[PDB]
From a paper:
The fusion protein for CoV is its spike (S) protein that decorates the virion surface as an extensive crown (hence, “corona”). The S protein is a heavily glycosylated type I membrane protein anchored in the viral membrane. It is first produced as a precursor that trimerizes and is thought to be cleaved by a furin-like protease into two fragments: the receptor-binding fragment S1 and the fusion fragment S2. To gain further insight, we aimed to determine the pre and post fusion states of full-length wild-type S protein of SARS-CoV-2.
Residue numbers in the entry:
A (entry chain A): 293 to 618, 633 to 676, 689 to 728
B (entry chain B): 729 to 1068
C (entry chain A): 972 to 1116
D (entry chain C): 972 to 1019
E (entry chain C): 729 to 777
Amino acid sequence: LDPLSETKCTLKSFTVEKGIYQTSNFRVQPTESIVRFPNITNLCPFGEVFNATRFASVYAWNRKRISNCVADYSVLYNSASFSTFKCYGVSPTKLNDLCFTNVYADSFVIRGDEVRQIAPGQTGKIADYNYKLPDDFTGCVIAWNSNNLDSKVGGNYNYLYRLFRKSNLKPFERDISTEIYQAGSTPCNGVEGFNCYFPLQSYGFQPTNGVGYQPYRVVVLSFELLHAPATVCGPKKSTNLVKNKCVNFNFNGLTGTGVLTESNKKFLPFQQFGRDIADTTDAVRDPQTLEILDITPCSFGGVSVITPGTNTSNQVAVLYQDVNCTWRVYSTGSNVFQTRAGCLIGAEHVNNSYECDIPIGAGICASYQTSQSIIAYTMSLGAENSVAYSNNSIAIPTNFTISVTTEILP
Amino acid sequence: VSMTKTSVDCTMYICGDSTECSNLLLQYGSFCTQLNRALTGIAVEQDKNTQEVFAQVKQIYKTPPIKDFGGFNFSQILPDPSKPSKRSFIEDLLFNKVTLADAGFIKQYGDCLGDIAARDLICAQKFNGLTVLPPLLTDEMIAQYTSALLAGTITSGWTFGAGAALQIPFAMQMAYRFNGIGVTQNVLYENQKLIANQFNSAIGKIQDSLSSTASALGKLQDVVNQNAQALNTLVKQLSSNFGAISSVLNDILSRLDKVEAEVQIDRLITGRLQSLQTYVTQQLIRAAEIRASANLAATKMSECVLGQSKRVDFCGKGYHLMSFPQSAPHGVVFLHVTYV
Amino acid sequence: AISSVLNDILSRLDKVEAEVQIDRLITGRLQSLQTYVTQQLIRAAEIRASANLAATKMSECVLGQSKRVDFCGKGYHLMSFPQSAPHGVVFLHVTYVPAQEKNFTTAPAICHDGKAHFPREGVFVSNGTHWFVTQRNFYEPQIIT
Amino acid sequence: AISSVLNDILSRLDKVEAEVQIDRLITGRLQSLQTYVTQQLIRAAEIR
Amino acid sequence: VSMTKTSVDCTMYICGDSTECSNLLLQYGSFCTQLNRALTGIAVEQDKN
Ligand SMILES: *[C@@H]1O[C@H](CO)[C@@H](O[C@@H]2O[C@H](CO)[C@@H](O[C@H]3O[C@H](CO)[C@@H](O)[C@H](O)[C@@H]3O)[C@H](O)[C@H]2NC(C)=O)[C@H](O)[C@H]1NC(C)=O
Ligand SMILES: *[C@@H]1O[C@H](CO)[C@@H](O[C@@H]2O[C@H](CO)[C@@H](O[C@H]3O[C@H](CO)[C@@H](O)[C@H](O)[C@@H]3O)[C@H](O)[C@H]2NC(C)=O)[C@H](O)[C@H]1NC(C)=O
Ligand SMILES: *[C@@H]1O[C@H](CO)[C@@H](O[C@@H]2O[C@H](CO)[C@@H](O[C@H]3O[C@H](CO)[C@@H](O)[C@H](O)[C@@H]3O)[C@H](O)[C@H]2NC(C)=O)[C@H](O)[C@H]1NC(C)=O
Ligand SMILES: *[C@@H]1O[C@H](CO)[C@@H](O)[C@H](O)[C@H]1NC(C)=O
């Protein structure tokens, strides 16, 4: 309701004693939202990813670069029917509000029972021998049953997986070798032998196969977010650019709040964001009209409330540190007093120096006096007294006062 | 004597410009206010510390214009009126030998935003809710108290502490102080020229010493430096993850939904709240170092300035005659005069 | 945690899911005790210093007579009396305070017979016409002998 | 965490699951050092 | 008059002989330092005392 009520709120009391109370830093609210996405008009190759007539074998899994396109994944709702769609670096809800820096779609076909192995940190012949995901995998994995497409009445053997390896392969490693595997201690040469196994084996995708032995198509989208200049983005329209106003900005999904300003920093082209000592993003390259913008938060400057006792009055004064009134204030005042400690509003500046009552700082104290109002003044140190010193004058007491004084010590 | 006052907007540091984080910080509650009660107790008593040392006399004595002080030359420590701040000559050296990162305690949004948000320590502090408050007594009011003590001493001796300032010729006063150290007063009068010259020459070396050597005011800079380092550490600790996916609060909220962000945000709140608890703990301990020092300076004021201490090595080496206070940034300098 | 109430967690969640929620409350409530104890250890040092001061004032203001200035109140300390208070001590400091000073002319020495005379105790003062030697802290003049 | 022994976590859990368990030990063991230092800073003031 | 100086290898206490732990401890950073600045202040003033 007002700064006085803020103190009551902070103190969790309806009555506030005389004094000066620190409150929240003065903070402007955002005027409007601003959204800035790289302008790309063509949509992403959703049809070429999720509809390709023939997918790759899992051992020879394909990788396609997705760039300069809009990630409007809504277009495939009517016809996708994904059995699995799991994201690992983002929440699925956020994908529309977000941009992506480099995007790779990995496409392959596997047995239905093995789709679980596509999660990062798994074991099994698929995870161990033809497709491994890293532990810090940033991406969304997608799979759907494809019995009607890939299965053949005589069994479709065009889909191969690797059954043997000397060691587990590294993340995102693709192994095409067909050289024979040596299961025993004997060496193996030529083409075949005892315990000499051909490393690849084919799925028997017959349409009569039990659900789980049916073919499942898998697409793995791997992407990086908010660290690098972006080239793929969600279907959000960019707003016009505004500066020197407090706004809820969104740059390439980098949502925030603060004042935008024209920067004099120079970014090498591979850089899009600048970060503070606090690692808070403090600069951004506008993605449509490339020019470096500074970001400064709007919340800044302290506020303190001077009050007499609640039992005495409800009137208060407000002190704004980091504000020069020669404004960033909650209210315009009839009486305003600029102090070295800040701009003091709601208190009458009086020249008469009294003893300090409420210390405002930098020599200023305040008090409640006559029709009563809060006065602000430069505190008096004491009475000024020139001593009578002379090179041949001395003062000597003719009398004494016995004086008892009480001193209290915890 | 004192250290920099500080106050923290607990929410603005932990949860800058994030309503989602601010709503989650409510689930901790009093912890943020407990921090502010501690810092206020520290700040409120920094004014006390300065009051206990300097405000010992509630009457601002002023020197006579005719400086016939028996041949002793206090011009180097008495106020220099023509200067904008009515400090003494030596005090202006002390205020130059201690350097502070900020001046005037007002730094507006204009001169701090944009290009200078990146650059300045204080701007980084203020944006993350860390503030440095002005002391109650200005450096001018401190000098007026120091002038009153020094002016009262030379014109009235120790009488101005025990009661009303009774004037006494300074050579007569120094004769009292020789009796204090067990040297008969006639030893002063029969050597007044030499004693006055040695004091004037000794005070001269004080100017030359403070002009020459860089490390003299270690204690007062060490306090300003430690307070600055503690805050500049507090801002750097905003870069820590504390196990969250990101140090940046917004990079979490823009990539994760409410429940997956709540886990990540909770770590930052826990870590950043612990950072404030650590900082406040250091400052409460540190304030106790300064309080003890301010209680010592207050006792040296009473016993070396307002009187003549018979205690050994309490007001420097030698037999204490008198001491003169000099204000310094966040501290006090005593010029101990001793018969050796 | 989902709840501040420890029992509302246990009545809604089983061992594995409660262990997560309970571990947060243990962490936060254990930290609350650590914070409280830290405040009290720091606070106890404020009291210890004040109790060491009060003990020194007992030894010196009460059990003696302190020549230290303003250590036992303002004025020249005569004696002090302790009075107990809840969690503290009150000292009633008795001090001799000069009351009614008069101006006098003074001199550092006197020349009787071609020599220089200095007070044994006290100071020389003239009332305008006659010179006397008096004690420094109380005007009680005497003929200079 | 599942264990006080730092190594018994790493020998039974992979990076993603170990990170959760290790993060608890870092938090608790770092808190133990912070508490120790706090006690010694207060104690050093008694000695000072 | 004084008390035993101490210094702590903050990494070795928390993360003794573990590289995986050490990499995670870096995510906290200045904590490991703030601790040893305090202990150095304690230790150095024992010589002062
Ligand atoms: C990436 O390629 C590496 C080199 O081809 C490979 O390391 C190699 O692994 C084989 C099989 O374990 C080793 O073969 C020899 O190993 C020892 C000698 O080290 C002999 O006793 C064996 O009989 C056999 O001859 C190679 O020595 C080894 N090469 C190197 C340089 O270490 C990696 O395993 C491959 N990584 C992946 C993920 O596939
Ligand atoms: C007490 O000591 C004072 C210095 O510590 C001394 O003041 C000094 O006086 C001399 C001579 O008057 C000045 O010398 C300069 O004077 C003018 C000033 O512009 C110049 O034009 C001259 O050429 C010469 O360089 C000193 O500047 C001055 N020092 C200060 C700090 O003011 C007092 O005279 C001493 N008091 C007594 C009673 O002797
Ligand atoms: C400074 O103090 C002096 C000492 O008190 C004082 O001189 C004294 O004055 C009184 C009278 O006021 C004289 O008293 C005698 O006067 C005659 C002398 O025979 C008698 O009839 C009286 O009964 C009484 O005995 C003192 O004799 C006289 N002392 C001296 C040494 O002369 C001055 O008057 C004082 N001066 C000022 C300015 O106050
Ligand atoms: C409040 O004010 C009333 C007078 O209006 C007075 O009688 C009462 O004692 C006051 N109480 C307190 C706690 O200040």
